[PDB]
């Protein structure tokens, strides 16, 4: 059906509007904390804290296989990153310290995000 087409057209262009976004959050994370998933070699306890992990690589990863639907998708990933990072780690930390900025500085991102999947459908 061209029904399909037209969702996929939409889709698609979903897909590349939250790829951009994607680039401007991780843009607010110079220290590439974030980048990468917390190593379970490294931390080999992790999940045991936290049980469902999240990081920018990963985001891209479901991002570029057109696997969020929606934004409100794409947000709750992004809150994962920063709020997985503010419980695993204490509060006088540059782990801790980092997800706050992030998060501070992200929220004037997706304030604009919001609006541009409103306005553009």
């Known amino acids: 059906s061209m029904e399909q087409v037209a969702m996929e057209l939409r889709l698609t262009e979903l897909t590349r509007l939250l790829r951009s976004v994607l680039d401007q959050l991780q843009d607010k994370d110079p220290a590439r904390i974030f980048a990468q998933p917390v190593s379970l070699k490294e931390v080999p306890d992790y ?62 991102v997706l304030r604009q995000a919001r609006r541009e999947v409103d306005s553009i459908g």
Do not use: S, W
């Open 47 to 108: 999940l045991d804290h936290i049980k469902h992990p999240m990081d920018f690589a990963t985001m891209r990863k479901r991002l570029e296989a057109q696997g969020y639907k929606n934004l409100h998708e794409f947000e709750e990933d992004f809150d994962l990153i920063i709020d997985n990072c503010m419980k695993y780690n204490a509060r006088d930390t540059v782990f801790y310290r980092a997800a706050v900025r992030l998060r501070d500085q992200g929220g004037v």
